């Protein structure tokens, strides 16, 4: 069954004393569970071993009480206790045959280390780097440095009892204490672990080799390292540093796992990197190193990861969100079944959830975060209960597209009715603004699973009134009629209509998504919202000929994408653009040609020529026909109907995929 273009995909690979089954590697990513949930964890990482991945690895498992990014609960690996606990996982990845792997971590200056109310370390006294909790990172004695090494051998031999066939040396993100110890921008010490190069990578070296005499014999020893900080100029690059760390310990590990550093530029949302990003920053790796390479590149394309090896930028195909999104993606090639991979859109809503500390989840794969909370599978549903029951969706939208597809998959006859000539919904003009084009593949993939089901009925012109859903006479009506932006400015911090919202030049998203722009002139968007759309009419506008200025009530622009990875490069976007971003000010009032604007934390006052207005401030329900269906229902017709999605109420995309699948699973129980 499986095209043997890809055979080579599925070679083992020697990695120190281990071998993997085959070249598909999960790299570590924080799943937002930690020893708190160890249930969810393995229900997690099962998933992906039972989808033929050859390496599954466990994220940052903290290494010392010095260490943590407390809230977010992570594995911990500082205590005998946690050995068993972390046993289950081995067992449930080794089960199916992958390699467990095991990020070892010491946050350095990078976490507050909360959760056991302890002082952060760091070569050099600083608060944290993502943290404004009131607790320095202290500067580290040298018997600080003695006790450290101590801990990482220590928490090595753990893993070896817990049975990882990989366990870390972790150096990149700027979440490590060795990063901080070779960033001369950190490290500002005047010992032999300070000044030179041969002095910021001693800790580095140091501790490599004490794990590798710890547990060497029967575990590879990998190294975790960013070759680049895209973050500031650091002078930590792959032709500098990056390039020197490799060089000096180059066949020292059994494998090399690089990246860039800094989450936002490592996790590169879809709005700004495509496939492959990293190929430049880590391609020098295997000129320098015998060892094993494995990089990640949001890798999706079977093709581009064939290449990616036959060209010799790496060994192993590194993933972690294209894992999330299709735990299965490597079975599938394997069976011929490459048109039917779940392809990531780069969304970044894993990234939102774990950076809020919360349980990580998927737009693409709603299963991702719930195999043990809601028993959801990847690929697997429960049978149809009476397979000859009949279910009408209404709604064409990713929640609607979602609910048919996991109701078609159980085996229940499935119709579908849309309104539009195309199918996706708000993703129909959505994927049509700028930067948000990969974000169709949630309306593609459902699309495609769902035409070639014979259960299927699929109508793409059929607006549908009361009566029509009750002549059809389906067993289940579920109502996905989804949302519309508002066009008062309501939705947030105004209860009241803003004066002038009426005024004609005053749009809302609803007409930059029906391509209705103004000619020229400038325009004000004043974000409400805090997510994307409102950057992103900003983006249409100004590549419009538009002088566009961001005006937000937050302090900072598009609040959200702190969480998504995206706000640094959202401001970097509209500083290229000439887009203007103003911060921490409301509108008070909107004139014929300027808006009053009050600024929050002390009500100064300003006048802002605008030739346009667009108000960013929410979403307002399509409920009528769910009403009229519960108002028709007189026990004859329509005795089952449920609505699902922006129709139940308004969230990011994730949230339609959500209830679709809820809705899917738990009909007729
Ligand atoms: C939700 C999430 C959690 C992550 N947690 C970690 C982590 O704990 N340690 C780490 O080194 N990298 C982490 N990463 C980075 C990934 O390991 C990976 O390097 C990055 O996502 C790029 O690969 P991709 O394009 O396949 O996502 C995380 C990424 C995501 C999306
Ligand atoms: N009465 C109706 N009959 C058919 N389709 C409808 C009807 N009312 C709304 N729709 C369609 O349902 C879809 C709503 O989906 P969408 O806005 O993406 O929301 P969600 O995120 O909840 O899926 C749109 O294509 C919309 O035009
Ligand atoms: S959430 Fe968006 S980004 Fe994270 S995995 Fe699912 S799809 Fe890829």
Not at 335 to 343: M, T
């Amino acid at each position: 069954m499986r095209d043997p273009r890809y055979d080579i995909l599925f070679e083992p690979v020697q990695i120190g004393p281990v071998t993997t089954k085959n070249r598909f590697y999960v790299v570590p990513h924080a799943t937002a569970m930690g020893m708190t949930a160890l249930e969810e964890m393995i229900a997690f990482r099962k998933a992906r071993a039972e989808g033929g991945w050859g390496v599954v690895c466990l994220e940052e498992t903290m290494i010392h009480e010095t260490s943590d990014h407390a809230p977010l609960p992570d594995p911990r690996m500082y205590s005998d206790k946690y050995i068993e606990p972390l046993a289950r996982v081995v067992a449930a990845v080794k089960e199916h045959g992958a390699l467990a792997g095991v990020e070892l971590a010491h946050a350095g200056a990078s976490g507050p280390a909360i959760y056991h109310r302890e002082h952060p370390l760091s070569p050099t006294t600083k608060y944290p780097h993502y943290f404004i909790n009131p607790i320095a990172a202290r500067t580290i004695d040298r018997q600080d440095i003695a006790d450290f090494r101590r801990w990482y051998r220590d928490a090595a031999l753990r893993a070896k009892r817990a049975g990882f066939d990989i366990v870390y040396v972790y150096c990149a993100h700027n979440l490590s204490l060795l990063q901080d110890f070779l960033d001369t921008r950190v490290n500002k010490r005047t010992d032999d672990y300070g000044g030179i190069f041969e002095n910021r990578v001693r800790l580095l070296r140091e501790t490599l080799s004490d794990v590798k005499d710890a547990v060497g014999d029967t575990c590879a020893v990998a190294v975790r390292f960013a070759v680049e900080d895209r973050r500031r100029q650091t002078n930590l690059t792959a032709l500098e540093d990056g390039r020197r760390v490799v060089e000096a310990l180059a066949d020292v590990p059994d494998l090399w796992d690089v990246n860039v550093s800094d989450w936002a530029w490592d996790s590169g949302s879809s709005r700004f990197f495509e496939e492959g990003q990293q190929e430049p920053f880590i391609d020098f790796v295997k000129k320098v190193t015998s060892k094993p390479v494995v990089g990640v590149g949001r890798f999706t394309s079977p093709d581009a990861m064939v290449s990616q090896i036959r060209r010799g930028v790496l060994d192993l195909i590194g993933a972690a969100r294209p894992s999330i999104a299709d735990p299965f993606l490597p079975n599938k090639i394997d069976a011929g079944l490459q048109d039917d991979i779940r392809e990531c859109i780069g969304c970044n809503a894993c990234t939102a959830e774990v950076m809020t500390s919360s349980r990580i989840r998927c737009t693409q794969n709603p299963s991702a975060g719930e195999e043990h909370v809601s028993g959801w599978h990847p690929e697997k549903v429960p049978p149809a209960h009476n397979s000859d029951a009949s279910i009408l969706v209404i709604g064409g939208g990713p929640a609607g597209l979602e609910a048919a597809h996991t109701l078609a998959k159980r085996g229940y006859q499935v119709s579908i009715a849309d309104a539009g000539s195309e199918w996706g919904g708000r993703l129909v003009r959505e994927r049509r603004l700028p930067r948000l084009s990969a974000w169709g593949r949630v309306v593609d993939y459902r699309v495609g699973q769902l035409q070639t089901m014979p259960n299927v009925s699929m109508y793409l012109d059929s607006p549908l009134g009361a009566d029509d859903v009750a002549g059809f006479e389906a067993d289940h009506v579920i109502v996905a009629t989804g949302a519309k932006w508002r066009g008062e400015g309501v939705g947030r911090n105004h209860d009241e209509p803003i004066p002038g919202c009426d005024l004609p030049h005053v749009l809302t998203p609803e007409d930059i998504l029906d391509g209705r722009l103004p000619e020229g002139g400038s325009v004000i968007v004043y974000d409400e919202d805090y997510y994307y759309m409102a950057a992103v009419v900003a983006d249409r506008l100004a590549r419009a000929g538009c002088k566009v200025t961001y005006v937000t009530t937050a302090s900072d622009p598009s609040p959200w994408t702190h969480n998504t990875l995206e706000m640094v490069h959202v401001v970097n976007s509209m500083n290229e653009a000439g887009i203007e971003i103003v911060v921490g000010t409301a509108i008070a009032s909107i004139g014929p040609s300027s808006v009053k604007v009050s600024r929050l934390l002390d009500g100064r006052e300003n006048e802002m020529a605008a030739d346009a207005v667009v108000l960013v401030t929410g979403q307002l329900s399509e409920d009528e026909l769910y009403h009229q269906l519960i108002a028709k229902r007189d026990g004859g017709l329509l005795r089952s109907v449920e609505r699902i999605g922006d129709c139940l109420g308004a969230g990011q995309i994730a949230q339609a995929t959500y209830d679709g699948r809820k809705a899917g699973m738990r009909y007729g129980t």
